[PDB]
UniProtKB/Swiss-Prot annotation, chain B:
Assembly information from the UniProt record: Interacts with isoform p14ARF of CDKN2A which strongly inhibits HUWE1 ubiquitin ligase activity. Interacts with MYCN, POLB and CDC6. Interacts with isoform 2 of PA2G4. Interacts with NR1D1. Interacts with AMBRA1. Interacts with HAPSTR1. Interacts with HAPSTR2. In hepatocytes, interacts with PAQR3; the interaction promotes PPARA poylubiquitination and STUB1-mediated degradation.
Domain notes: The HECT domain mediates inhibition of the transcriptional activity of p53.
Organism ancestry: Eukaryota, Metazoa, Chordata, Craniata, Vertebrata
Domain of life: Eukaryota
Record-given protein name: E3 ubiquitin-protein ligase HUWE1
Annotated gene: HUWE1
Organism of this sequence: Homo sapiens (Human)
Record PTM: Phosphorylated on tyrosine; phosphorylation is probably required for its ability to inhibit TP53 transactivation.
Protein family per UniProt: Belongs to the UPL family. TOM1/PTR1 subfamily.
Tissues in which the UniProt entry reports expression: Weakly expressed in heart, brain and placenta but not in other tissues. Expressed in a number of cell lines, predominantly in those from colorectal carcinomas.
Coiled-coil positions: none
Subcellular location: Cytoplasm; Nucleus; Mitochondrion
Length: 127, 446
């Protein structure tokens, strides 16, 4: 009966769905090879705004490894080596592979997916 | 022979006069007691059935039938019942026949005025006759009657038309009739199955015609909320969707219909509803989806369906209050990626309450000290049974004032979930990498 939940959903069942201040995450995002006005990044923020609270939580788990919201805000987001901001990296491999996450750095590697729809499908399939 | 046929005729004339005060249940119990005598019963029933057939001065009974029309129930010139009064004579006779089923007359009647299993065939023919076939009430009563009595080909066609045409209780009694008939003979079973399939195929053909108009009109709506008038004949309470699903539920009840031109166009229709950025717009096909998962997903194609329409089937389930594991969509319990989290949460909570529904849950006290709650709870509970744990806990802190038990329980859970991660118990330790998560402390052997 518990096996109906995913490894995400059991956490969301025990501790509940968080309310994600997408503005706080955006305020605490670092862009390395993308830029803040890249079209794939505007698609990323549009997608993440379009995801419901549960798919947002699954994204947060995908990139940070947890759904827990920091009391002080995502400025206080910890990583392996102290406070690590969330971060989006362009994955220069082929764009027929999913984004990939390294949660101890809170690191997203993101291929330069050609479209909003395809990027959204791949992200939703990852989470 | 307690009573003669003239005294029975005098009693039976009471069935025609519609007086609200008259106690017709008491009259039914008089006829029931009289009908313990087999010859009286047989004459009584032959008269009541002649009254039904003839529905389809002492005898001057004026019934108000319509506006400005006060009819005489009897026209004597060979005695006929004025069709305005007929539906009431039918209603009172079926009311009496339902009790006798739980357990010449005209010439005698004019002589006054001048001063189970065999007739089941007549009662099945009765469904064709207009005063009955019109009235949903008389049909429901006659079907309840047949459903009691049941404990040929045209007569089954007329029984099935009761489902293919217009009463949820009367059509569930028709389902009972068709079952209890099928219990009789493999040949009537087969003929009723094949004539159900024939009617369901007609319904499917016209449903594909209706959805083809719907899809076309959604094309014409997009290509330049949803109130397409083609939708009205699917919303309708008497829609072919509800007839088709009803018939399929009876087919599936008798099993213990090849329409891929329907199923694939229901498919592309759903896909064009979902792409049209409206949500409840799907629900006008919910019974067609439930029919799909009835005919398919036999106690696969439904899995390809649940993939390509996943979020749609989720909109269906999320809107439906039908409990996931009692409705048709229970099969997908095991293919769990095809449901939303909160749908699975609802199913979870309903199945948990269903499995533990036999258990009465009580309230249960827990006496703890604010400084020792964790170990006091361990001592109190660690030998308790699961069903004693399932009782509702209220927590009393020693010497503290009374407070809301819900807030005090939330505090108790919060304090416990904290103390779990106190290193003094050595239960959980933070991942040295993340430093905010927690996993089993490999140093709890201390």
């Amino acid at each position: 009966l518990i096996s109906i939940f995913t490894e995400q959903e059991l956490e969301l069942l025990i501790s509940g769905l968080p309310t994600i201040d997408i503005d706080d995450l955006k305020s605490n995002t670092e862009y390395h090879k993308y830029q803040s006005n890249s079209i794939q990044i505007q698609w990323f923020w549009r997608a993440l705004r379009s995801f419901d609270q549960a798919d947002r939580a699954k994204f947060l788990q995908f990139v940070t490894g947890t759904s827990k919201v920091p009391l002080q805000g995502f400025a206080a987001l910890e990583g392996m080596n102290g406070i690590q901001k969330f971060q989006i990296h362009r994955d220069d491999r082929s764009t027929d592979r999913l984004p990939s996450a390294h949660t101890c750095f809170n690191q997203l590697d993101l291929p330069a997916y050609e479209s909003f729809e395809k990027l959204r499908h791949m992200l939703l399939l990852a989470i | 022979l307690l009573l003669d046929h003239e005294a029975l005729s005098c009693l039976l004339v009471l069935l025609f006069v519609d007086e609200p005060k008259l106690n017709t249940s008491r009259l039914h119990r008089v006829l029931r007691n009289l009908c313990y005598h087999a010859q009286t019963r047989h004459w009584v029933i032959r008269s009541l059935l002649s009254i039904l057939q003839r529905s389809s001065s002492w005898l001057s009974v004026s019934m108000d039938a319509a506006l400005g029309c006060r009819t005489n129930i009897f026209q004597i010139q060979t005695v006929h019942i004025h069709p305005q009064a007929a539906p009431v004579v039918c209603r009172h006779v079926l009311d009496t026949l339902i009790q006798l089923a739980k357990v010449d007359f005209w010439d005698l009647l004019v002589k006054l005025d001048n001063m189970e299993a065999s007739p089941l065939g007549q009662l099945m023919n009765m469904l064709s006759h207009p005063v009955i076939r019109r009235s949903s009430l008389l049909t429901e009563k006659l079907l309840r009657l047949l459903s009691l009595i049941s404990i040929g080909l045209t007569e089954n066609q007329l029984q099935l038309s009761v489902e293919v045409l217009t009463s949820e209780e009367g059509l569930e009694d028709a389902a009972n009739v068709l079952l209890q008939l099928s219990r009789g003979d493999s040949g009537t079973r087969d003929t009723v199955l094949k004539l159900l399939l024939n009617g369901a195929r007609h319904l499917g053909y016209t449903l594909c015609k209706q959805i083809g108009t719907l899809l076309a009109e959604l094309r014409e709506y997009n290509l330049e909320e949803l109130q397409l008038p083609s939708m009205s004949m699917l919303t309708s309470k008497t829609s072919t969707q509800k007839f088709f699903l009803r018939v399929l539920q009876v087919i599936i009840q008798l099993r213990d219909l090849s329409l891929d031109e329907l199923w694939d166009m229901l498919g592309e229709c759903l896909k064009e509803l979902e792409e049209s950025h409206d949500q409840h717009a799907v629900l006008v096909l919910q019974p067609a989806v439930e029919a799909f998962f009835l005919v398919h997903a036999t106690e696969q194609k439904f899995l390809r369906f649940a993939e390509t329409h996943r979020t749609v089937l989720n909109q269906i389930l999320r809107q439906s209050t039908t409990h996931l594991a009692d409705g048709p969509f229970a099969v997908l319990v095991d293919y769990i990626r095809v449901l939303d989290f909160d749908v699975k949460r609802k199913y979870f909570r309903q199945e948990l309450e269903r499995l533990d529904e036999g258990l009465r849950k009580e309230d249960m006290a827990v006496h703890v000290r604010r400084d020792h709650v964790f170990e006091d709870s361990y001592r109190e509970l660690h030998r308790k049974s699961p069903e004693e744990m399932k009782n509702r806990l209220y927590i009393v802190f020693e010497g503290e004032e009374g407070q809301d038990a819900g807030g005090l329980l939330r505090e108790w859970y919060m304090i416990i979930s904290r103390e779990m991660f106190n290193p003094m118990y050595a239960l959980f330790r933070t991942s040295p990498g993340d430093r905010v998560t927690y996993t089993i402390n490999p140093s709890s052997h201390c």
